Design a protein around this ligand. Structure first.
Ligand SMILES: Nc1ncnc2c1ncn2[C@@H]1O[C@H](COP(=O)(O)OP(=O)(O)O)[C@@H](O)[C@H]1O
Ligand SMILES: [Zn+2]
Ligand SMILES: [Zn+2]
Lengths: 138, 179, 167, 379
């Protein structure tokens, strides 16, 4: 794909939009007789998964959890998946040596269950405004 | 170069046995624990240490020159020991590359001079770009490209990797002959 | 010109040259490139070296000024010090409790303290003393961060005593 | 019905997420990394060919709807926040991308200023929008934007980034790490926009009116011998690893002053409120003055809101504005979300209203039939 330069010799697509793409990237349509590109074709959503702890989550659970894994965490300083270390647990990165102790988050007795993100400061004012405009829109 | 794989003429000195070709220049200190079941290639000045290892490699595995495959030590409270790594089928480790990875998946293209961290798991049909640092205890999903000094999701691979990568490693092996 | 010490599991298959001075409990891995060009390579107890690690005392080859009268520049290295895979090093004075990461190019005159780590695949040629208990990450930028506590690596070294026999 | 998505395409940063949320889910730089290009091209660019703009927006919206948000585009509605007097062809293209390629149900082209007003709850308020390109103001009175009394000046992020680059190149002191411990000027011909933005945010701050007014006359040097206040200490900033740029203390508190400088014309970020408010209807004066709103990421800069409100009350006493806006009480509103994500929050609050959304919003079936997006220009 990359080692051999597939991005050199390209195939053309028929339709409204003409595109020059490698055969490796393109797809053949069997229903009819016309190969079409990744650009030309329409995209869908099937399943969500975490890149660290590979766990297939359903679409409903994602909407509640805001498209995030509860167990796994990413470091804020550098962008890498954190790891739980014990002494009774603290969160630490491998690349940079940023700890959860640095910012001043207390160690939890339970491994995963204890850790949480604080509630949004203007969440109560939010709901009051929605309900006002909801009644006014009605 | 333009899809077609190019000629590479090997010297007389190389250990060719049961399909597996291993350069005599390349030391592999600990020949007992390391195992090469398939028709593997190991280029000159490369290292595969037996520091309490079980280095199983693929059918058509390729490791270019000046590149190291060492197992990582697991920091366990019960007992600190070196975790035995398992290189998958049709694995392509590029030149001058550092690998301290535990369980490297099948059909992977590890880039040039890219340092993979301690206890790092790689799932099948992935690609690490050149001059990239995967930190310790990181996972990369299938049909993915990880890059940068942080070592994070850059984008997705072509759909046809499973079928395509077979041609690459087998062609390189077939094209790589003695002078 | 070799001062081999008992307890230290220096492997015979690793390459050594010049007026070396080996430490009490050092553990050198095979294909570890140590040279004593001008002055001697002084090694502290627990200073393990893993894989490719170019440790030279060739300031006469680097600059070649014909100055400082004798200019021995003896390479002092501290205790409990992890040299990782492919890390270039050339420091006249180096402190205890420091871990340079894999493919880390350390400068010609950079002095390391305690609890300090160099970034993986990061090069630092510029001469500058490292603060107490601070880590560097990334090649694109240095992005220095002070650590909470120094990290010891004793357990790792202690276990190699069992492995190295019959290898 | 499904929770409608909110997008807000800006020159610097794009806000993205779902309706009825406390803030935006993803906020990222509005760029795309194309193969071959070393620096990523900016997705929103005014005055280019439609085909080239179409491809960039197609590429960008794809990244937002899959990598950042995880949801099918065809399933649920869109609430596109874009500032008033956004170029015609750009807005026409953005809609044409959403309707043709992605096949979205319906898009709603909300003006950023009217959305910012909803977040507070107040029906009437003056709204200043200090963005990247231009710092725009637009009085909103009881739901009706007053286009008659508009105001804009190029004193935003772009104008500030350019001013920082100019000052750094004059007093250029970098430690390359190659016998460059001594002050080395202009080793690099240009500084990348990504670095300049990071320096601006961390190092530079907005000075007090009293200190700022002295800084203006000091650098002018108007028949006076060293009449400048004592600057802050010089901060050393790393460039591309080894190269360490020593930022002068003067640059930090002088770079910002270009926004609040009079420059003879009497056209600052401060003046733009009073210039607009004086042009407003006589009945609306006292209501708009009392309800000020300061959105945009440029106003996030530390101590901007204090300097602005102070600079206002100083420019009030000036003889031009002294007659009309003399005895007026200027009070600033503190919005619930941060100054950057006020615009987005309005669209989310509006997106939560499923009943009104469907009616006001332009359906795909209408666009496919007509091919005419409604605007504040003539139909
Ligand atoms: N949190 C922040 N703190 C300080 N400055 C900021 C912050 N966020 C953004 N900025 C600056 O202000 C600008 C805000 O632009 P923005 O409003 O996001 O874009 P647009 O006007 O195109 O919608 C950015 O270009 C940046 O330079
Ligand atoms: Zn997870
Ligand atoms: Zn980190």
């Amino acid at each position: 794909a990359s080692l051999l330069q597939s991005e050199r010799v390209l195939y053309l697509v028929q339709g409204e939009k003409k595109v020059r793409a490698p055969l490796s990237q393109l797809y053949f349509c069997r229903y009819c007789s016309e190969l079409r590109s990744l650009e030309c074709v329409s995209h869908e959503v099937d399943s969500h998964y975490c890149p660290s702890c590979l766990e297939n989550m359903p679409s409903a659970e994602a909407k509640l959890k805001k498209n995030r894994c509860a167990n796994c965490f990413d470091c804020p300083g550098c962008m890498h998946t954190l790891s739980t270390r014990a002494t009774a647990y603290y969160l630490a990165c491998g690349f940079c040596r940023w700890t959860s102790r640095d910012v001043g988050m207390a160690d939890k007795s339970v491994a995963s269950g204890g850790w949480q993100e604080p509630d949004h400061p203007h969440t109560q004012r939010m709901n009051k405004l929605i309900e006002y405009y909801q009644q006014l829109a009605q | 170069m333009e899809l077609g794989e190019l000629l590479y003429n090997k010297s007389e000195y190389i250990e060719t046995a049961s399909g597996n070709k291993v350069s005599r220049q390349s030391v592999l200190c600990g020949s007992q624990n390391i195992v090469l079941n398939g028709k593997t290639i190991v280029m000159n000045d490369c290292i595969i240490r037996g520091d309490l290892a079980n280095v199983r490699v693929g059918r058509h595995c390729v490791v270019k020159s000046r590149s190291v495959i060492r197992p990582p030590f697991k920091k366990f409270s019960k007992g600190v020991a070196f975790f035995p790594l398992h290189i998958g089928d049709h694995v392509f480790i590029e030149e001058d590359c550092v690998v301290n990875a535990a369980q490297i998946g099948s059909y992977v293209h590890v880039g040039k001079n890219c340092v993979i961290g301690r206890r790092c798991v790689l799932k099948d049909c992935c690609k690490i770009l050149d001059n990239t640092v995967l930190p310790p205890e990181t996972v990369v999903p299938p049909f993915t490209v990880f890059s940068g000094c942080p070592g994070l999701f850059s984008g997705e691979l072509p759909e046809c990797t499973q079928e395509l990568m077979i041609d690459v490693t087998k062609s390189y092996y077939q094209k790589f002959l003695p002078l | 010109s070799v001062k081999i010490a008992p307890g230290a599991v220096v492997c015979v298959e690793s390459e050594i040259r010049g007026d070396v001075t080996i430490g009490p409990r050092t553990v050198i891995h095979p294909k570890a490139r140590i040279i004593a060009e001008a002055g001697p390579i002084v090694i502290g107890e627990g200073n393990l070296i893993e894989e490719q690690a170019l440790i030279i005392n060739a300031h006469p080859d680097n600059i070649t000024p014909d100055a400082e009268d004798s200019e021995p520049k003896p390479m002092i290295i501290g205790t409990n010090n992890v040299f990782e895979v492919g890390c270039y090093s050339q420091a006249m004075k180096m402190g205890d409790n420091n871990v340079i990461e894999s493919k880390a190019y350390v400068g010609r005159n950079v002095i390391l303290t305690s609890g300090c780590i160099i970034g993986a695949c990061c090069n630092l040629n510029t001469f500058e003393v490292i603060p107490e208990n601070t880590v560097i990450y990334g090649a694109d930028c240095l992005r220095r961060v002070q650590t909470e506590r120094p990290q010891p690596q004793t357990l790792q070294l202690d276990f190699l005593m069992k492995i190295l026999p019959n290898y | 019905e499904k929770t409608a998505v909110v997008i807000d395409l800006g020159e610097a940063f794009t806000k993205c997420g779902f309706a009825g949320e406390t803030g935006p889910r993803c906020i990222i730089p509005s760029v795309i990394k194309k193969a071959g290009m070393p620096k990523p091209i900016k997705v929103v660019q005014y005055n280019i060919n439609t085909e080239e703009l179409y491809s960039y927006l197609k590429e960008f919206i794809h990244i937002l709807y899959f990598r950042h948000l995880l949801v099918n585009p065809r399933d649920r509605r869109v609430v596109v926040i874009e500032s008033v007097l956004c170029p015609s062809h750009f807005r026409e293209t953005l809609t044409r991308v959403l309707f043709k390629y992605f096949e979205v149900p319906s898009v709603l082209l909300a003006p950023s200023h009217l959305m910012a007003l909803l977040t507070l709850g107040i029906n009437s308020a003056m709204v200043l929008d200090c963005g990247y390109r231009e710092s725009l103001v637009l009085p909103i009175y009881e739901g009706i934007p007053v286009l008659n009394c508009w105001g804009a000046l190029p004193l935003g992020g772009k104008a500030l980034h350019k001013e920082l680059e100019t000052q750094l190149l004059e007093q250029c002191t970098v430690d390359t790490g190659a016998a460059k411990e001594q002050s080395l000027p202009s080793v690099m011909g240009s500084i990348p926009e990504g670095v300049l933005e990071d320096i601006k945010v961390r190092t530079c701050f907005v000075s007090d009116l009293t200190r700022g007014l002295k800084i203006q006359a000091a650098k002018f040097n108007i028949d006076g011998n060293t009449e400048r206040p004592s600057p802050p200490p010089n901060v050393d900033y790393p460039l591309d690893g080894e190269k360490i740029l020593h930022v002068l203390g003067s640059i930090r508190d002088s770079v910002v002053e270009i926004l609040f400088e009079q420059d003879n014309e009497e056209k600052s970020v401060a003046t733009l409120i009073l210039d607009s408010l004086m042009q407003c209807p006589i009945d609306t004066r006292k209501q708009l003055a009392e309800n000020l709103v300061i959105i945009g990421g440029t106003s996030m800069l530390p101590g901007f809101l204090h300097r602005l409100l102070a600079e206002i009350r100083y420019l009030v006493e000036k003889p031009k504005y002294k007659k009309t806006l003399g005895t007026k009480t200027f009070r600033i509103h503190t919005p619930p979300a941060k100054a950057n994500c006020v615009a987005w929050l309005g669209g989310a609050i509006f997106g939560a209203l499923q009943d009104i959304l469907g009616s006001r919003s332009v359906s795909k079936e209408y666009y496919n039939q007509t091919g005419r997006i409604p605007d504040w220009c003539s139909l």
